[PDB]
Design a protein around this ligand. Structure first.
Ligand SMILES: COc1cccc(SCc2nc(C(=O)O)cs2)c1
Length: 133
């Protein structure tokens, strides 16, 4: 019953500061513009101890499966090759990505009927709000 309130299909409804977050991470101009238009569907499921998060959009389709606390390799939608660890901290999914001596953290939280995604790179935060699909 790990992660029950996250499971489901979610659709992006608002974004703030995502272009700047992508700049801070190192994403180039053309990718930022096309990625920033996307309105992904995020599909979260659990089977035993394995959590799967899929993102489907007209920019990219991604899929990660993982066990909490257990590092895994990930190729991000912007084509970074990162080492990721996802944990639950106080009911918040905390996803840390490490590459080239850099680090970014993506937090996913249930707030009212929404799923709120906060992405942080250095001093730059972006907030992305998803609704049930
Ligand atoms: C989601 O699409 C893109 C496009 C280009 C870079 C990235 S970095 C990974 C992140 N995914 C979200 C999220 O809202 O699910 C926020 S941060 C993602």
């Amino acid at each position: 019953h790990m992660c029950d309130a996250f499971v489901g299909t979610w659709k992006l409804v608002s974004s703030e500061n995502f272009d700047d977050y992508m700049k801070e991470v190192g994403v180039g101009f053309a990718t930022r513009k096309v990625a920033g238009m996307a309105k992904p569907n995020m599909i979260i499921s659990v089977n035993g101890d394995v959590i799967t998060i899929k993102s489907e959009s007209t920019f990219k389709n991604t899929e990660i499966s993982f066990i909490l606390g257990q590092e895994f390799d990930e190729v991000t939608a912007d084509d970074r090759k990162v080492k990721s660890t996802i944990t639950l901290d106080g009911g918040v999914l905390v996803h840390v990505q490490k590459w080239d001596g850099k680090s970014t953290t993506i937090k996913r939280k249930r707030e009212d009927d929404k799923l709120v995604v906060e992405c942080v790179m250095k001093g730059v935060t972006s907030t992305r709000v998803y609704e049930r699909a």
